[PDB]
Amino acid sequence: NITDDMRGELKNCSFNATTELRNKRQKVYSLFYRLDIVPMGENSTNYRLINC
Amino acid sequence: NTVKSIRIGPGQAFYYTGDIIGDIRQAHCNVSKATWNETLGKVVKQLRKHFGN
Amino acid sequence: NLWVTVYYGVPVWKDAETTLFCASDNVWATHACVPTDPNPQEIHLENVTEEFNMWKNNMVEQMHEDIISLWDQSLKPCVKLTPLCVTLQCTNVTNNITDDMRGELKNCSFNATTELRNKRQKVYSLFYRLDIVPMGENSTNYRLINCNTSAITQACPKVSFEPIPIHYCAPAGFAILKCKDKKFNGTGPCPSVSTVQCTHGIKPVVSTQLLLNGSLAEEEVIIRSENITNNAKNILVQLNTPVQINCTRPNNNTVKSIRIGPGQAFYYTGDIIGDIRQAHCNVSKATWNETLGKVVKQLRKHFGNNTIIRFAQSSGGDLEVTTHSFNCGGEFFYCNTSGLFNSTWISNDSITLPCRIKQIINMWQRIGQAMYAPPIQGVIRCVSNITGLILTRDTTETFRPGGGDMRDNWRSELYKYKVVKIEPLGVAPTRCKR
Amino acid sequence: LGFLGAAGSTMGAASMTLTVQARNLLSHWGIKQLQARVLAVEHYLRDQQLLGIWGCSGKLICCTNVPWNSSWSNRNLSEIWDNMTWLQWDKEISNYTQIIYGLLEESQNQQEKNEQDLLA
Amino acid sequence: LGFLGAAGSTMGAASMTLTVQARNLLSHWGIKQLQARVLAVEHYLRDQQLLGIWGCSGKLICCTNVPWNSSWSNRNLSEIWDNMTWLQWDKEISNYTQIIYGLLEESQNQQEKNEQDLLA
Amino acid sequence: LGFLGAAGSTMGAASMTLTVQARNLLSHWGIKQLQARVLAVEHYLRDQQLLGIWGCSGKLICCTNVPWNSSWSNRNLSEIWDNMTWLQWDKEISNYTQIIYGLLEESQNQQEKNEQDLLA
Ligand SMILES: *[C@@H]1O[C@H](CO)[C@@H](O[C@@H]2O[C@H](CO)[C@@H](O[C@@H]3O[C@H](CO)[C@@H](O)[C@H](O[C@H]4O[C@H](CO)[C@@H](O)[C@H](O)[C@@H]4O)[C@@H]3O)[C@H](O)[C@H]2NC(C)=O)[C@H](O)[C@H]1NC(C)=O
Ligand SMILES: *[C@@H]1O[C@H](CO)[C@@H](O[C@@H]2O[C@H](CO)[C@@H](O)[C@H](O)[C@H]2NC(C)=O)[C@H](O)[C@H]1NC(C)=O
Ligand SMILES: *[C@@H]1O[C@H](CO)[C@@H](O[C@@H]2O[C@H](CO)[C@@H](O)[C@H](O)[C@H]2NC(C)=O)[C@H](O)[C@H]1NC(C)=O
Ligand SMILES: *[C@@H]1O[C@H](CO)[C@@H](O[C@@H]2O[C@H](CO)[C@@H](O)[C@H](O)[C@H]2NC(C)=O)[C@H](O)[C@H]1NC(C)=O
Ligand SMILES: *[C@@H]1O[C@H](CO)[C@@H](O[C@@H]2O[C@H](CO)[C@@H](O)[C@H](O)[C@H]2NC(C)=O)[C@H](O)[C@H]1NC(C)=O
Ligand SMILES: *[C@@H]1O[C@H](CO[C@@H]2O[C@@H](C)[C@@H](O)[C@@H](O)[C@@H]2O)[C@@H](O)[C@H](O)[C@H]1NC(C)=O
Ligand SMILES: *[C@@H]1O[C@H](CO[C@@H]2O[C@@H](C)[C@@H](O)[C@@H](O)[C@@H]2O)[C@@H](O)[C@H](O)[C@H]1NC(C)=O
Ligand SMILES: *[C@@H]1O[C@H](CO[C@@H]2O[C@@H](C)[C@@H](O)[C@@H](O)[C@@H]2O)[C@@H](O)[C@H](O)[C@H]1NC(C)=O
Ligand SMILES: *[C@@H]1O[C@H](CO[C@@H]2O[C@@H](C)[C@@H](O)[C@@H](O)[C@@H]2O)[C@@H](O)[C@H](O)[C@H]1NC(C)=O
Ligand SMILES: *[C@@H]1O[C@H](CO[C@@H]2O[C@@H](C)[C@@H](O)[C@@H](O)[C@@H]2O)[C@@H](O)[C@H](O)[C@H]1NC(C)=O
Ligand SMILES: *[C@@H]1O[C@H](CO[C@@H]2O[C@@H](C)[C@@H](O)[C@@H](O)[C@@H]2O)[C@@H](O)[C@H](O)[C@H]1NC(C)=O
Ligand SMILES: *[C@@H]1O[C@H](CO)[C@@H](O)[C@H](O)[C@H]1NC(C)=O
Ligand SMILES: *[C@@H]1O[C@H](CO)[C@@H](O)[C@H](O)[C@H]1NC(C)=O
Ligand SMILES: *[C@@H]1O[C@H](CO)[C@@H](O)[C@H](O)[C@H]1NC(C)=O
Ligand SMILES: *[C@@H]1O[C@H](CO)[C@@H](O)[C@H](O)[C@H]1NC(C)=O
Ligand SMILES: *[C@@H]1O[C@H](CO)[C@@H](O)[C@H](O)[C@H]1NC(C)=O
Ligand SMILES: *[C@@H]1O[C@H](CO)[C@@H](O)[C@H](O)[C@H]1NC(C)=O
Ligand SMILES: *[C@@H]1O[C@H](CO)[C@@H](O)[C@H](O)[C@H]1NC(C)=O
Ligand SMILES: *[C@@H]1O[C@H](CO)[C@@H](O)[C@H](O)[C@H]1NC(C)=O
Ligand SMILES: *[C@@H]1O[C@H](CO)[C@@H](O)[C@H](O)[C@H]1NC(C)=O
Ligand SMILES: *[C@@H]1O[C@H](CO)[C@@H](O)[C@H](O)[C@H]1NC(C)=O
Ligand SMILES: *[C@@H]1O[C@H](CO)[C@@H](O)[C@H](O)[C@H]1NC(C)=O
Ligand SMILES: *[C@@H]1O[C@H](CO)[C@@H](O)[C@H](O)[C@H]1NC(C)=O
Ligand SMILES: *[C@@H]1O[C@H](CO)[C@@H](O)[C@H](O)[C@H]1NC(C)=O
């Protein structure tokens, strides 16, 4: 339930994080502010962290 | 905000917002209106000593 | 009648805490040590009586920092064994294993990185069970013990951990006073004090409950504690005779290596030649029994005389404090001393101590660091002197091995030294005037 | 005959070795040793400055114009220079030291202004 | 009466606080602070060396044999010591200073040779 | 006329430039420069301490009460002070310098005690 003023401000992002073991990966779900991510391609949900 | 964490490496923990409990509202700041209007009036009075009266 | 006269160069001093500079002749005696040990001059002060105190001496702390720092610096140029934090599938060793070795060793295979990013290699090695932790309860999948916490650094094989004596010298304006009272118990007035330029060399030997290769008491066993009636304090017992201990790792190891990256070589035990036996240490039985009898006689001067003194094994804690830890030829041993402290004293045999070996250690009581000790090729034997014990205390008194803190080992050598500042300026009345 | 060798001797004996001790006041890893050397120098200089302020510059034994209030130490000469070591003396005038230093400073300032007014 | 307390007073008054100021001249992260300590020491030593060269070692007030050429400042004594403050005096004769220092050095060299030739 | 300009001249000439050399004795990447400055200061202070001990503080030319045993150097005043340069002289009495310094120290201690027992 998002106040109109906040629509588009937050995005729910799923990513592949590294783990303690070099050969394993884990799925992580976290909430980012729109100001910290950028789109990559347009008309797609591929987003990356702003400073990479 | 509910904060969650994962290890991403050998003793290396990453923190992130896991979830929001309840409604989503915009962050904001409150400034008393009368106090602020008086404050600028004083600033203007002093600016007029450097600028035209 | 009398007037103030000012004198400068007056032989007066006050207690002070300053930085001491090390002087020596591979981690120890680094290039960071004024190359001297010339003839550290000793100038007996005759009729002076100085209030000495260990368990406050800041020299203990300086040495602790120094040693920890020198140790960490030696690992700065060494390979980080992080590419190796992978699932290691493990089975039992295909050799003739005695009962005491069950299971103690595991034959682990894994996929290792190599020099080129698109290449990989299959490697297997022999690990001690104490260095690996099962992943998924009972399964062939295991991970190295320290991959859930800090990254392990491989010690550089060219650097020897053998202790090298380091002398601690006073900066100008300061002096070190040495207590020569043979019966000194660590505190209070010392009737025979001399001034020295620099301390004797002290070997930074790292061990727990049995102090190895330290100084011996001149005449009798000396028992020193901050507060003898306080069970929270440790008791340092200085022996007046050494007890010889003979340690071995009687297994002929073949050491192999791989490249895990661009100039990064990893060392591991490839195989074992001959039968698999438990590492162990020997202490002469009669010598040890005489040694404890002497300790008991001195304990009875602080405790009741018509009493009972019992010795027992450490009651608990991790391997670092329940065993006798030491470096023998570069390997890290954890020996069980319950065979030494199992008797009650009321008003050519030898004792063999079983020993565990670990390759992944933490050294200092720290969480954020871990080191891998490369295995050593061949068979290891070392002989050392037991020069003191670290005991804790529970009618009847019961004593157990302690020694978890390193500062106490260094106290057993630094207890006779104090640092003071020279205060050459002062005044006194005389009959003279301008 | 060496450094602090006279520390256990009486004040009247120890005063003869003042040059022995005076000469032993001067001579990231390494920073703390460098700090120690710098501070040793500052300590040394403060003592020399102070002797200068009192008019004792350049000498090991300096007589002054300040008298000894018996309330600081009412001991006689054969109980200070024959029965006491400098270490025991220092722990007897310890809490009258700043008083004495202040008086010595005042005495020298008065002497300097009076000498200048005599050179006219 | 504290450090620089006399800065606003006249030269004839300020001259009585010379010890107040003299005693306040002495006492990778941390390197800049070491540089400051070392330079403070070198500065101090250069001034002390200079007083030694001029024959003023060990004293806060030193009279010399160099006369006052009136071209440097023709103000009289009642104008210099009763009214002017040391800050204003310093500004007034700041560019005739390295002439005065040179004269003081030359005077002392002559003074030393004459005393040796007399102790013969 | 500048620093060491007199080094090739005779001792009897070079002795007049003592202030020229005295004024040139003072004033991880960057650590070695601080170490050099600190050591330069300690060296300087040790020279000053000896002058203090021998009673030569504050002066560049100091006469003493120690005689010249001819076994150190039997050359006459002409040859020393009108032929030899200081460099050549120093290389002659190089072996017999510690002896001289020890004698100077003892003489000053005798002088300080006698003076005190005369102001009594
Ligand atoms: C208590 O003191 C004793 C006596 O000092 C001490 O025992 C000594 O241990 C060292 C290290 O294990 C032994 O040194 C070795 O001697 C053999 C014999 O020739 C050499 O081959 C060895 O050289 C190899 O290893 C070096 C690295 O350590 C390499 O640099 C070298 O190139 C070779 O590969 C090495 O010199 C020493 O012989 C014994 N001494 C005796 C009398 O047995 C004991 O360890 C001390 N106790 C504790 C806990 O430290
Ligand atoms: C650990 O396991 C490896 C296999 O993963 C064993 O190595 C093999 O041994 C047989 C019998 O000698 C040889 O024919 C194979 O060529 C070896 N394989 C490799 C890759 O070397 C190894 O012997 C086992 N070691 C122990 C101590 O059990
Ligand atoms: C190392 O990598 C090899 C593949 O290069 C793994 O081999 C696999 O082993 C499992 C178990 O039997 C088989 O099901 C797979 O088919 C094998 N892979 C292939 C493509 O042959 C090996 O297990 C890895 N070792 C570990 C545990 O790291
Ligand atoms: C420590 O003591 C053990 C005995 O408990 C010694 O073991 C014997 O060693 C010889 C070879 O020198 C063998 O022939 C014997 O069979 C062994 N005895 C037993 C019961 O197995 C060991 O050598 C001693 N020395 C140490 C640790 O240096
Ligand atoms: C050293 O060896 C002794 C055996 O001699 C171990 O002592 C046993 O410990 C278990 C578990 O607490 C007890 O149930 C047994 O009764 C103990 N045996 C005896 C004879 O008392 C001891 O735990 C070992 N210590 C270390 C650090 O390995
Ligand atoms: C000596 O000093 C007295 C003042 O000093 C008092 O006692 C000394 C020990 C300190 O505790 C100080 O703080 C006290 O104020 C004067 O009464 C006395 O007149 C003085 N005597 C002389 C000879 O001047
Ligand atoms: C100095 O005083 C000496 C001892 O006298 C006594 O003890 C001291 C501590 C005071 O309590 C004092 O009142 C006592 O009378 C004498 O033995 C010695 O002769 C005296 N010396 C001189 C030369 O006055
Ligand atoms: C006094 O000063 C007169 C003028 O000095 C000149 O100007 C000053 C600022 C300096 O630059 C100085 O070197 C110049 O010579 C001299 O002519 C006169 O000789 C001086 N008198 C004395 C007492 O030496
Ligand atoms: C001191 O001078 C006062 C006025 O000073 C005049 O101008 C200065 C710059 C000098 O040139 C000075 O010599 C001049 O006289 C006089 O009001 C005052 O009376 C003079 N006092 C004395 C003691 O001569
Ligand atoms: C002068 O020197 C004489 C020889 O003794 C020594 O050898 C010479 C070369 C010097 O090094 C000197 O310092 C040594 O003492 C002494 O026999 C003689 O007593 C000395 N005379 C004096 C004035 O001390
Ligand atoms: C000084 O002596 C000159 C000759 O020197 C002789 O040899 C030197 C090494 C010394 O041992 C010295 O004492 C010897 O006399 C004479 O040519 C010269 O005229 C003398 N000058 C004087 C008299 O001062
Ligand atoms: C998602 O949010 C964007 C604004 O960032 C909005 O334009 C779009 O219509 C929303 N889509 C859905 C399915 O809610
Ligand atoms: C801030 O909160 C306090 C209560 O803690 C309230 O009294 C004050 O008026 C508020 N100020 C503004 C600008 O809203
Ligand atoms: C701010 O000050 C102006 C000028 O006095 C006034 O006209 C205006 O109404 C004031 N606004 C508020 C909120 O007080
Ligand atoms: C500016 O206006 C103020 C009144 O608000 C008055 O007192 C002041 O004298 C005026 N200054 C000039 C330069 O007109
Ligand atoms: C491997 O060793 C363990 C521990 O000694 C034992 O319990 C297990 O049965 C052994 N497995 C095989 C296949 O020998
Ligand atoms: C690593 O695993 C062990 C399992 O016994 C656990 O006790 C330890 O706390 C874990 N370390 C971290 C950093 O989670
Ligand atoms: C050490 O000896 C002193 C002698 O004065 C005594 O007071 C102190 O209690 C003793 N301490 C211990 C632990 O024996
Ligand atoms: C030793 O511990 C006891 C605890 O009851 C305490 O009363 C005593 O004062 C302590 N001794 C010293 C020297 O502090
Ligand atoms: C240790 O070895 C020596 C020979 O180097 C032997 O004489 C001694 O008895 C052995 N001591 C023990 C306790 O095994
Ligand atoms: C140890 O000492 C006790 C008491 O004197 C004695 O009864 C026992 O036989 C001794 N044991 C050995 C091995 O000497
Ligand atoms: C304690 O026993 C010893 C003999 O071991 C004896 O010399 C001493 O006098 C006894 N002390 C007391 C208080 O009984
Ligand atoms: C202590 O000695 C007894 C024999 O007197 C033995 O039965 C017991 O197992 C020993 N305890 C330990 C820990 O070695
Ligand atoms: C280990 O075995 C090899 C191969 O037989 C042999 O050359 C080496 O000398 C042995 N080392 C020891 C300590 O027995």
Ligand SMILES: *[C@@H]1O[C@H](CO)[C@@H](O)[C@H](O)[C@H]1NC(C)=O
């Ligand atoms: C044990 O002590 C004796 C006697 O001081 C000494 O000769 C021997 O070398 C020492 N042993 C070791 C390993 O240092």
Ligand SMILES: *[C@@H]1O[C@H](CO)[C@@H](O)[C@H](O)[C@H]1NC(C)=O
């Ligand atoms: C110590 O006192 C004795 C007299 O009991 C004396 O002969 C000796 O010279 C004194 N030592 C010192 C350093 O003063």
Ligand SMILES: *[C@@H]1O[C@H](CO)[C@@H](O)[C@H](O)[C@H]1NC(C)=O
């Ligand atoms: C102190 O010295 C004096 C003079 O020698 C003497 O009379 C007096 O008894 C001495 N007092 C002591 C022994 O402290």
Ligand SMILES: *[C@@H]1O[C@H](CO)[C@@H](O)[C@H](O)[C@H]1NC(C)=O
């Ligand atoms: C001052 O020092 C004297 C001598 O040490 C001592 O007796 C007295 O108690 C001290 N007074 C204070 C305030 O500590």
Ligand SMILES: *[C@@H]1O[C@H](CO)[C@@H](O)[C@H](O)[C@H]1NC(C)=O
């Ligand atoms: C400041 O000037 C006044 C005269 O206006 C004078 O009385 C006072 O003493 C001066 N202050 C100082 C510190 O000299």
Ligand SMILES: *[C@@H]1O[C@H](CO)[C@@H](O)[C@H](O)[C@H]1NC(C)=O
């Ligand atoms: C200058 O000095 C005179 C005489 O002391 C004094 O009367 C006058 O007030 C002073 N003036 C200033 C500006 O200090």
Ligand SMILES: *[C@@H]1O[C@H](CO)[C@@H](O)[C@H](O)[C@H]1NC(C)=O
């Ligand atoms: C030098 O100082 C005098 C007096 O303060 C001044 O008049 C002159 O202008 C100054 N010259 C320079 C170089 O500024």
Ligand SMILES: *[C@@H]1O[C@H](CO)[C@@H](O)[C@H](O)[C@H]1NC(C)=O
């Ligand atoms: C160098 O020697 C010549 C004689 O050959 C002499 O005239 C000149 O003054 C000497 N130079 C110096 C600096 O003394």
Ligand SMILES: *[C@@H]1O[C@H](CO)[C@@H](O)[C@H](O)[C@H]1NC(C)=O
């Ligand atoms: C220089 O040496 C000669 C020969 O020894 C000597 O005659 C002369 O007097 C000495 N010096 C001078 C020029 O006085």
Ligand SMILES: *[C@@H]1O[C@H](CO)[C@@H](O)[C@H](O)[C@H]1NC(C)=O
């Ligand atoms: C000084 O000593 C050295 C070394 O013994 C010797 O060669 C030289 O001739 C000596 N010089 C003098 C002036 O005696």
